[PDB]
Structures are given as structure tokens and as C-alpha cells.
Design a protein around this ligand. Structure first.
Ligand SMILES: [Mg+2]
Length: 249
């Protein structure tokens, strides 16, 4: 990644103190949000995860599918279950999974996306664009850099796989962490986009101003139906359509 030279190829916000309490923050999911689910990256991840269940838990493929979906469904991350019940080391799992995707051959600079996010930053209606992902920081950063958007965000809340289980979406504590890290004072000053219906559900219940459910094709049942109060779009470039006012001075 260090040989990338395109705009947005370098992270410009710190990773890892009172603030203006009127801060407005737009939280961005990453996987299947900042890139399309139709990249099939999610399918690549799942293949790798299923391989891990087989090689490390010694499960047949069908038992692997079932347990993976069960953990994913209850926790928002299979790895949460693997840590708690199977005493798996999440960083080693992560090394084999997310961190071994052929992303460099899949993700390329998304110029329309870059330009859309720039307009959102430049309206003055939103104070911070804050990343909020269940991925570990390695993968999250890699996605931003390849997509050419690593300079367009003010911070990153990611799931800390160092824990031995993980605080993650859709659990409330993950949202409380994003609020604290981003400097957000009230959920009312927050907006949120994510492809997972369950994640959006939590954002809505907590009192976030506007939550957008991003469903490129059909809903993944495991991730949840579109919840009540949510706005649905099929591509992140449709944000200008549904929260137009945030793009206007
Ligand atoms: Mg996502």
C-alpha cells in the first residue's frame, strides 16, 4: 500500500479532551458501504472464515456454515463467538481472514465517492465524518487507501481484536464507544449509514437523527430486515438524493 500515489491513498487522521458539544457527526460503516457488496469481497471473507471454522474447529462444512451464521447473527461478528466459546485468538484469525484478501486487485480509487464525501465535508452542515466498523484497523485502513478516501475522515472506531468478547455493532456498547471517540455529545447530532439492518436498528433506537440502510440488491437476512424509521438506498452515491440538505451551505 505504501507505493500508492493517488489522492486519498494516505491516512490523515489519527488512529488509537472536551469538544464543541454542538458537533454534528456522520458515521460511516465500511464493508459493503464504502464499496459495493457486489465486489464480492464479503463472499471472499466468508470463504476464508468458513475455512477457519473447518481447519481450526475441525467442523464439517455444513456445521461450519451453521455455527458461523449463528455467531454472525447473534453478535454481528463470528469472531465474537470464536473468542468466547472456542478461545480463538482474534488477531491470528484476522491475519488469516480479512488481512489475507486480494483487495489490491479488487478495490480501485472511487472518484465519484471521493467527490461526494468532499462535498459533504465542505457544506459546513457536518463537523466530522467518522468511520465505524466491526473490522480491525488493518483491513479498514487498507480499504480507505485503495479506494482513495483515506483523507476524507476525521477518525476511526474499529473493533479491537486484541480483546480475549469483542465490543461490536449492533451492540449498544459499540455505539457508545463511537460516540465517545468521535466527541459526539448527543445521538441527536448524529447520522449513520450501514448495510446491516440490525446496526441501523440500534442507531435509530439510540436516537440518531437519520439512519440510512444501504441495500444494494436484497437484504441479507442474517444481517436483518430494514428496520422502522430507516431510509433505504441501493448505492452510497445516492446519499445526495436522500439527505440533500447536508450537502448545501
Ligand atoms: Mg458493513
Amino acid at each position: 500500500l505504501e507505493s500508492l500515489t493517488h489522492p486519498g491513498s494516505k491516512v490523515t487522521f489519527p488512529i488509537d479532551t472536551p469538544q464543541n458539544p454542538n458537533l454534528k457527526v456522520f458515521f460511516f460503516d465500511i464493508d459493503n458501504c464504502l464499496y459495493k457488496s457486489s465486489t464480492r469481497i464479503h463472499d471472499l471473507m466468508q470463504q476464508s472464515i468458513l475455512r477457519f471454522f473447518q481447519t481450526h474447529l475441525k467442523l464439517s462444512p455444513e456445521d461450519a456454515h451453521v455455527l458461523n451464521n449463528s455467531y454472525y447473527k447473534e453478535y454481528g461478528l463470528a469472531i465474537r463467538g470464536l473468542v468466547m466459546f472456542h478461545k480463538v485468538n482474534a488477531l491470528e484469525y484476522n491475519r488469516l481472514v480479512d488481512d489475507s484478501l486480494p483487495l489490491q486487485d479488487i478495490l480501485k480509487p472511487d472518484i465519484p465517492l471521493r467527490n461526494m464525501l468532499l462535498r459533504l465535508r465542505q457544506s459546513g452542515k457536518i463537523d466530522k465524518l467518522w468511520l465505524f466498523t466491526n473490522a480491525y484497523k488493518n483491513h479498514a485502513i487498507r480499504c480507505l487507501r485503495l479506494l482513495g478516501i483515506a483523507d476524507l475522515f476525521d477518525g476511526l472506531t474499529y473493533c479491537d481484536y486484541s480483546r480475549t468478547t469483542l465490543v461490536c455493532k449492533p451492540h449498544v456498547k459499540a455505539f457508545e464507544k463511537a460516540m465517545k471517540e468521535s466527541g459526539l455529545a448527543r445521538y441527536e447530532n448524529a447520522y449513520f449509514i450501514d448495510d446491516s439492518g440490525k446496526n441501523i436498528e440500534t442507531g435509530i433506537k439510540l436516537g440518531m437523527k437519520t439512519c440510512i440502510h444501504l441495500v444494494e440488491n436484497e437484504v441479507n437476512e442474517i444481517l436483518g430486515q430494514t428496520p422502522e424509521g430507516a431510509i433505504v438506498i441501493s448505492d452510497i452515491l445516492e446519499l445526495p438524493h436522500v439527505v440533500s440538505d447536508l450537502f448545501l451551505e
